[PDB]
Amino acid sequence: SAAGEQHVIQLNQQGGKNLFCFPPISGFGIYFKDLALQLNHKAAVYGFHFIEEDSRIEQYVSRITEIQPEGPYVLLGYSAGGNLAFEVVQAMEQKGLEVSDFIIVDAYKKDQSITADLPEAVRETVMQKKRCYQEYWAQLINEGRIKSNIHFIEAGIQTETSGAMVLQKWQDAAEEGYAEYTGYGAHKDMLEGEFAEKNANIILNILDKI
Numbered sequence: 001s002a003a004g005e006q007h008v009i010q011l012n013q014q015g016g017k018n019l020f021c022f023p024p025i026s027g028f029g030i031y032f033k034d035l036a037l038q039l040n041h042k043a044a045v046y047g048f049h050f051i052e053e054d055s056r057i058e059q060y061v062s063r064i065t066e067i068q069p070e071g072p073y074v075l076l077g078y079s080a081g082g083n084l085a086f087e088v089v090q091a092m093e094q095k096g097l098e099v100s101d102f103i104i105v106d107a108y109k110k111d112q113s114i115t116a117d118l119p120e121a122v123r124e125t126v127m128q129k130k131r132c133y134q135e136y137w138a139q140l141i142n143e144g145r146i147k148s149n150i151h152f153i154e155a156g157i158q159t160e161t162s163g164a165m166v167l168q169k170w171q172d173a174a175e176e177g178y179a180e181y182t183g184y185g186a187h188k189d190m191l192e193g194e195f196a197e198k199n200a201n202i203i204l205n206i207l208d209k210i
Helices: 029-037 056-067 080-094 122-127 128-141 195-209
Strands: 008-009 016-021 042-050 073-078 101-106 147-155 179-181
Touching: 008 029, 008 056, 008 147, 016 029, 016 080, 016 122, 029 042, 029 195, 042 056, 073 080, 080 101, 080 128, 101 195, 122 128
Parallel strands: 016 042, 016 073, 073 101, 101 147, 147 179
Antiparallel strands: 008 042
């Protein structure tokens, strides 16, 4: 890493399983704060930042195994972070690590690239994580499968759904187990505010059934 800093915040008490969480496009692990509150003393919630270096994937893998030296691993990605978490899983699995389960909340398998989506000095620094994430995500392509079970949790409120997506629900990214779950609230709001709790029980139950 750049200055010796970490790129993950332990968000709640250690205990039960470790749940390694990959953020939405804004880029900051602190996003997973409400998730963490819901599962305090049920699962240890770790919220990763989007890492702007090119070595991000190795760094996530490296950080993950520092915090939890022994497999198996449970990972989660939310929204854009589902696409990113997918790569990490593949990287982990490439190295012989066991990822037992991969929880995808409101993210759709990204099969092509698209075109890339306070004083000015500070505005431009503060904003560079999201802009960098938007741009990593734009070029990103998820290929193939993972041996991890996939838990696909979609939004409970879905208002404009272009069927292109519906073929994009990760059924063909599963070597092994696959399952689908309608969660609560719309895209934007699944893991904050009122839905965090309702969606958190799902995640817990997935964790408990492992």
